[PDB]
Amino acid sequence: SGFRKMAFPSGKVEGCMVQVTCGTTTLNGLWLDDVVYCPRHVICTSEDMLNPNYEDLLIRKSNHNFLVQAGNVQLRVIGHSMQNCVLKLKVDTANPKTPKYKFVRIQPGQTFSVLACYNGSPSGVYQCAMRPNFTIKGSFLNGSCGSVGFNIDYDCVSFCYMHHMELPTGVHAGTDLEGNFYGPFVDRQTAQAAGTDTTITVNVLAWLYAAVINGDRWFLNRFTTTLNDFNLVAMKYNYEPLTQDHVDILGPLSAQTGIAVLDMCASLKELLQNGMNGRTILGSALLEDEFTPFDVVRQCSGVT
Amino acid sequence: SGFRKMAFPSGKVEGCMVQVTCGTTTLNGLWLDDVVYCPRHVICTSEDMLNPNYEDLLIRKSNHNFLVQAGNVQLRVIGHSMQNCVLKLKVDTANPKTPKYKFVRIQPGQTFSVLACYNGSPSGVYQCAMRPNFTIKGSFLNGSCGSVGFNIDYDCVSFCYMHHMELPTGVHAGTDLEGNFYGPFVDRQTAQAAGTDTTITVNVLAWLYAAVINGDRWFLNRFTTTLNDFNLVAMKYNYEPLTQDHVDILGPLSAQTGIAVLDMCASLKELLQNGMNGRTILGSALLEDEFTPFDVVRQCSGVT
Numbered sequence: 001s002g003f004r005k006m007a008f009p010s011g012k013v014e015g016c017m018v019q020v021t022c023g024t025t026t027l028n029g030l031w032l033d034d035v036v037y038c039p040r041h042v043i044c045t046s047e048d049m050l051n052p053n054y055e056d057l058l059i060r061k062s063n064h065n066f067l068v069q070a071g072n073v074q075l076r077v078i079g080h081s082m083q084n085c086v087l088k089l090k091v092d093t094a095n096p097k098t099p100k101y102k103f104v105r106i107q108p109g110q111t112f113s114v115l116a117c118y119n120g121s122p123s124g125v126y127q128c129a130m131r132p133n134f135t136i137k138g139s140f141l142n143g144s145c146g147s148v149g150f151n152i153d154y155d156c157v158s159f160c161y162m163h164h165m166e167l168p169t170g171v172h173a174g175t176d177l178e179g180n181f182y183g184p185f186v187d188r189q190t191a192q193a194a195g196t197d198t199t200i201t202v203n204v205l206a207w208l209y210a211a212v213i214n215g216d217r218w219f220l221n222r223f224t225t226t227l228n229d230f231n232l233v234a235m236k237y238n239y240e241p242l243t244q245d246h247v248d249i250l251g252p253l254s255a256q257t258g259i260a261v262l263d264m265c266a267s268l269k270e271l272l273q274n275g276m277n278g279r280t281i282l283g284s285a286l287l288e289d290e291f292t293p294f295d296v297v298r299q300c301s302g303v304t
Numbered sequence: 305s306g307f308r309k310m311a312f313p314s315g316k317v318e319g320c321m322v323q324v325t326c327g328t329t330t331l332n333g334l335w336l337d338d339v340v341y342c343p344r345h346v347i348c349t350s351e352d353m354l355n356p357n358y359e360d361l362l363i364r365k366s367n368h369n370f371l372v373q374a375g376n377v378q379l380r381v382i383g384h385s386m387q388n389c390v391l392k393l394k395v396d397t398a399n400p401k402t403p404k405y406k407f408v409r410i411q412p413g414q415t416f417s418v419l420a421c422y423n424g425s426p427s428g429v430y431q432c433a434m435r436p437n438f439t440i441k442g443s444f445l446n447g448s449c450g451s452v453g454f455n456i457d458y459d460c461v462s463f464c465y466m467h468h469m470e471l472p473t474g475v476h477a478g479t480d481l482e483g484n485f486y487g488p489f490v491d492r493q494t495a496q497a498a499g500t501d502t503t504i505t506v507n508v509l510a511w512l513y514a515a516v517i518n519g520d521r522w523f524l525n526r527f528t529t530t531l532n533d534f535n536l537v538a539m540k541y542n543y544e545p546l547t548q549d550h551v552d553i554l555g556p557l558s559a560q561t562g563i564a565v566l567d568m569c570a571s572l573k574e575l576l577q578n579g580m581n582g583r584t585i586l587g588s589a590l591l592e593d594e595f596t597p598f599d600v601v602r603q604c605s606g607v608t
């Protein structure tokens with residue numbers, strides 16, 4: 001028993017991290033096969049960031065200007081190209097530690113592990129969710145750009161995120177591995193607003209099921225609700241509307257606990273309306289939304 | 305900016321995890337050099353666990369009874385010995401992935417990363433603290449025994465914990481890598497009480513400094529206190545008494561923020577006495593104590 005904000009083991013991703021330097025800017029790159037992927041803003045100076053013309057900036061750069069270092073060994077760059085907001089630096093050596101991998105674009109509300117890196121070196125790993133507003137609440141400092149988000153299914157790493165920037169609000173924005181930003185963000189040092197963030201309702205319910213499985217049951221009540229009644233409450237508390245697709249994904253947890261999804265919705269409704277009254281659920285004094293139903297089943301069943 | 309419950313990158317530890325089977329029991333082992341370390345209760349049947357005589361049980365076991373598998377390859381056991389609550393299985397092959405390592409006994413209040421494993425395979429990684437009562441609030445299911453806790457300093461892994469059991473209360477107990485239990489626990493399926501747990505005050509203050517660094521400042525007040533006045537409050541709220549050693553360790557964070565430690569203590573005092581009034585600090589509605597002053601500096605400076 002016990003429930004923790006668990007990240008995937010980061011080993012397969014650590015073996016892919018490299019340092020990329022261009023001019024005076026250093027950030028992280030991801031070395032898979034004979035390609036190094038990194039944020040295209042590696043070619044910018046702090047002055048360029050205010051309004052960069054990436055096409056014009058990249059034209060003043062040659063293969064030899066991109067310094068790629070894997071540990072203490074230098075990689076030879078034989079090609080460079082820009083795909084959306086990422087650069088693909090072709091190198092002459094395939095990464096011997098390349099895991100089985102995929103590039104995936106995750107949906108908002110989905111979770112992933114971030115391997116925070118500096119100078120091509122891993123510093124830490126944590127689990128987070130892609131917010132409904134397509135930002136992530138990460139932990140990133142200067143030099144962390146190019147750090148990636150991922151999920152692991154047995155031996156396959158699905159890379160879903162590459163870190164690019166921190167908004168003036170302190171939340172984080174980045175791209176998929178094809179360089180497409182999640183959300184309306186651009187890689188420019190300009191004021192950019194993330195829209196209203198909402199709570200990922202299906203994840204809160206999944207975590208309530210995890211709480212019941214792990215012994216925390218005080219919040220269970222004698223009430224039930226309907227999807228429409230629940231959604232009136234979800235709207236008022238800036239929670240994502242619950243759909244039958246979400247009820248269906250919660251099926252396994254409903255079956256395991258014997259608590260019908262709409263009954264768990266009524267417990268959630270009462271927690272939203274009355275608060276926690278100074279009590280905790282799984283060591284938290286707020287409703288946690290960064291665990292998907294898949295994460296709850298995985299952690300509660302020991303999937304390796 | 306941003307502050308997360310970050311674990312160390314687990315790669316160096318993943319390369320050491322093996323599966324150990326004895327009879328019908330399977331758990332995890334740690335393969336370092338030519339030795340595999342695992343909980344000695346791998347030799348028990350569920351019936352033995354109620355009151356095991358490990359010496360007598362181990363005498364009915366030979367080298368060939370310990371099945372050690374690293375991935376899909378079998379290791380040849382050439383020796384076995386019990387050291388406190390761990391078994392050391394000597395194998396004929398040194399682990400080619402053995403990192404630079406140390407075995408350390410951590411102090412209560414210190415933090416470490418746990419690589420949860422099942423059948424010698426890593427499932428997840430999370431950060432936790434050794435509670436003042438020498439338990440950990442982990443996430444462990446059947447087969448997780450032998451999963452280890454560790455810290456990493458550049459290239460050196462300091463192993464500090466090996467998982468052995470879950471108390472009937474749902475908290476976890478284990479040993480250092482010499483097999484010495486943290487706390488009064490024994491490896492027996494009997495009712496065992498963990499003493500009163502207290503909040504790690506120096507860690508809460510460190511996290512309050514992390515909150516100030518990352519923009520969360522609402523809790524700062526116009527008050528100050530003394531170590532004795534603060535400790536009267538700490539005693540009432542089951543917080544560990546603050547010492548000058550703790551004030552000294554908080555020195556760097558006090559210097560970075562310009563907030564004297566006793567002034568941060570007065571903010572903590574007011575938070576203990578008044579609560580949070582429905583507000584949050586670093587995304588938490590409770591006072592977080594599983595970050596040491598070292599963790600705060602490391603995360604806030606990007607140490608890799």
Ligand SMILES: COC[C@H](NC(=O)C[C@@H]1C(=O)Nc2ccc(F)cc21)c1cccc(Br)c1
Nearest residue numbers: 041140141142164165166187188189190305
């Ligand atoms: C180097 O400043 C530029 C800035 N970079 C970050 O926010 C990246 C990084 C971060 O997540 N936090 C943080 C804190 C301190 C830093 F020095 C750097 C960071 C940027 C702004 C707008 C668009 C783009 Br693309 C990049």
Ligand SMILES: COC[C@H](NC(=O)C[C@@H]1C(=O)Nc2ccc(F)cc21)c1cccc(Br)c1
Nearest residue numbers: 001345444445446468469470491492493494
């Ligand atoms: C196999 O039960 C024995 C038990 N093992 C655990 O608690 C280990 C493990 C855990 O942390 N949770 C959990 C949940 C379900 C399990 F089946 C196993 C676990 C034990 C009790 C007393 C002393 C000793 Br040593 C070991």
